[PDB]
């Protein structure tokens, strides 16, 4: 199973309206990721810290998984998650994480400054730390801070699609990624493809070769897409739907229903999951002694 958790949405501000051409382009790149092969896609959306957040409930997310991607799912056979990377630079007055977090699935951050990087790892409840690989690293990444943050949770995320943009950006990208791999102690590394087009898509064995040539091993790369990728999905998926990893509204069937795998069988209206009477306390004993299922 493969997770690609940094596909961007062609919108930056809430005042802008997405045209149908970008939506069709996203449909074509999802068909591209379904063509060669992938398992999970978590599409990303960017907001700033100094913007004016809307005081709405059902209008915070211009993602619309149900009406357009619910139609794409039946011909596709995959799933989509909606996530936000927080572009936070200064500790301003804007703090509405209790609505933006519970509205979406995965909460990320994009720090630029010194103190913001500290208060993100310290107090801000997020899932992933993304750095601006297009621009310079802020000051320096320390070992014991990032190590304690990985031991607390949140892992670092490397965007190999940002090197496919320009020529000059590749040097700054590698200079950031080698420092991230060195200061992260190769524990918290989750990789993702930041492509805005299907014309910049790659296969698993090429991304593995890229991670080989950057400095991280190969078995640890595939383990990062098998173990480390799908666990940080489950972290935010249990934090925002259910309680703080405590009591889940997701049906535990044999091999078909899961909190990660069965998204459509859970009513995403509020919380609930309508399940038929599969548990009868009257005449059901041990599982190997049953005869009706």
């Amino acid at each position: 199973m493969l997770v690609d958790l940094n596909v961007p949405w062609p919108q930056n501000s809430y005042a802008d309206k997405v045209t149908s051409q970008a939506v069709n382009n996203l449909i074509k790149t999802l068909s591209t990721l379904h063509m060669l092969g992938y398992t999970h896609i978590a599409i990303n959306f960017t907001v700033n810290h100094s913007e004016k957040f809307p005081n709405d409930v059902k209008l915070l997310n211009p993602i619309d998984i149900k009406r357009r991607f619910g139609e794409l799912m039946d011909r596709t056979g995959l799933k989509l998650y909606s996530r936000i990377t927080l572009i936070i630079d200064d500790p301003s007055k804007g703090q509405s994480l209790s609505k933006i977090s519970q509205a979406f699935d995965i909460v990320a951050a994009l720090p630029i400054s010194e103190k913001g990087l500290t208060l993100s790892t310290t107090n801000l409840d997020i899932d992933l730390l993304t750095f601006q690989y297009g621009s310079r690293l802020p000051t320096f990444l320390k070992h014991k801070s990032i190590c304690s943050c990985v031991n607390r949770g949140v892992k670092l995320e490397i965007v190999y699609g940002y090197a496919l943009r320009d020529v000059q950006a590749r040097r700054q990208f590698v200079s950031n990624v080698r420092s991230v791999i060195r200061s992260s102690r190769s524990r918290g590394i989750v990789i993702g493809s930041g492509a805005m087009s299907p014309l910049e898509c790659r296969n698993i064995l090429g991304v593995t070769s890229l991670i080989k040539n950057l400095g991280l091993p190969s078995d640890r790369c595939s383990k990062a897409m098998g173990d480390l990728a799908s666990l940080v999905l489950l972290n935010g998926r249990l934090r925002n739907k259910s309680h703080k990893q405590t009591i889940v509204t997701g049906g535990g069937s044999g091999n078909g229903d899961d909190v990660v795998n069965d998204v459509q069988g859970i009513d995403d209206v509020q919380t609930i999951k309508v399940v038929k009477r599969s548990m009868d306390a009257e005449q059901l004993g041990h599982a190997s002694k049953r005869h009706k299922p």
Binding site: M35, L199, G206, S209, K212, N213
Partner: protein
């Protein structure tokens, strides 16, 4: 009492979208070499351009490329790096590297060119074992 790695095969498949381009344009054999030299010239310099690679069993947007072992990733990182642009095709293309093996055993079709390539390799392996 060991075996020195001679080279390694690489299985490429040019995934090309925008079906009008896939139906109109037809990549010939010189375009493969020109685009691979352009890809090794964009991301790498002279030493990355001097990577020894030859062409074997070229099909319609399908390629088998032999590259020496000590620069294996030096090849396979660059192929997933460069994007085709402004070379006789209006749209850019994507590359899918399907599988890698260092022991000659791949099964594509029941075609007879692979048996001929295996015989050419065994004629050199017998000279490696004897001489």
């Amino acid at each position: 009492k060991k075996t020195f790695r001679e080279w390694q095969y690489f299985k490429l498949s040019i995934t090309s979208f925008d079906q009008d381009v896939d139906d109109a344009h037809a990549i010939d054999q010189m375009t493969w070499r020109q685009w691979l030299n352009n890809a090794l010239k964009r991301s790498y310099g002279i030493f990355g351009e001097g990577v020894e690679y030859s062409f074997l069993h070229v099909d319609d947007k399908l390629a088998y490329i032999r590259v020496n072992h000590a620069d294996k990733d030096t090849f396979s990182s660059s192929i997933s790096t460069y994007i085709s642009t402004d070379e006789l095709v209006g749209s850019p293309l994507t590359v899918s590297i399907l599988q890698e093996s260092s022991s000659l055993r791949l099964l594509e079709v029941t075609d007879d060119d692979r048996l001929w390539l295996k015989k050419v390799m065994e004629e050199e392996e017998q000279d490696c074992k004897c001489i």
